[PDB]
């Protein structure tokens, strides 16, 4: 859509949108364009030092897809999968040749090719689903045995920031009521040893430093549940694949006018790899990427009470507090939607064709001759394409994760009944 790159699109109130239609259902087109239009020969033949610069093999023919740009899919989503193409109707390759031989009656060549390609067929045809399928039933069936303690153990971490949030919130109504008493028995767990001056009554010096030991235990517990958090979702990805190897054979070309046949073999690895990716059902359609907090926000909550040089105490600390719990709350809530509605949304479907070693045979005239060769491919075989369905799926994470969400959203409520 014009005013935006490919797989951009304006939304309803003019967000940035990925154009889903584009990403997966891109129009295909074939590119011809010679990219290795020469190819050298520079040694000697038969006492004839030669010299040349040659064309070689044309009529590329590739279809292939146009490159786009993506935007996130849900709350920290990664970005989504989008279908490329890259086939070609044969496989190309260069080839930087020594051949050189010494018999005969001054029957003798050195020369250098470089640069000089040819084709193979392609083997673009082949599906693993036999190899996969079963790797995915057996990374479902597992899944619960080796994660569960894993997923529980950051459900308790979530649930202990609740107990620091509540805490606090106990601490910052006592400052609110103006019971300096209630303030310093909340103060009073963090030190084994009891004292209490009281040279004279400061409620929010007393807050801001008394309870240091508690926003020190936050900031810790915070950043453990983000990273407890972003390594649990990373478990909705799941990916799954299997490679073969496959031999083409290249045979009867003749660089340097017919003076020697070349013939080798090419060892492929067919490589099939099958991706599916869970997550809020809901907010893949229209996720607005302005309403994303940034990762720094969270990062930054954490320790602002540890902010040593933090002007807003002194003038305007109801407000400071207050806003600091619901920002916290407000990313809580949003992290709880990524436990709630749980579906595979995206996924793929990848082939693609890669090169291993390759072995040249040279024979002139009947008769074998030394060859040594360096090989690089040109052209070969990609075909990523999005699918949003695997018949497969067996698990059902909403009631796995059913107890996240329950807790992020209690924590969130109580965030909210703070009051200035």
Known sequence: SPK???GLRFGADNEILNDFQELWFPDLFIESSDTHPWYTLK?????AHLDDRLPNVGGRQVRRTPHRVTVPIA???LRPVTTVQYDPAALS??????VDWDFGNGDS?????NDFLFRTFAPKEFDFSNSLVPRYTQAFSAFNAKYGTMIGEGLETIKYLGLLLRRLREGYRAVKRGDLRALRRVIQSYHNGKWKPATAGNLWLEFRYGLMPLFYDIRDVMLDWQNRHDKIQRLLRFSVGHGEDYVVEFDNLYPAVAYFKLKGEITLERRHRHGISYANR????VFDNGSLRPVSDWKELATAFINPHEVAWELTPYSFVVDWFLNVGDILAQQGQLYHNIDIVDGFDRRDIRLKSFT????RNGRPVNVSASLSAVDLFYSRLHTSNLPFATLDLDTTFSSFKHVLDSIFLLTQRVKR
Not at 282 to 285: I, L, M, R, V
């Open 4 to 6: 935006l790159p490919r």
């Open 43 to 47: 040694g000697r033949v038969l006492n």
């Open 75 to 77: 709350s920290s989503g």
């Open 93 to 98: 390759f260069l080839l930087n040749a020594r």
């Open 109 to 113: 060549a050195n020369l250098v090719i």
């Open 282 to 285: 809901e907010g893949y359609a």
């Open 360 to 363: 040249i045979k040279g024979e």
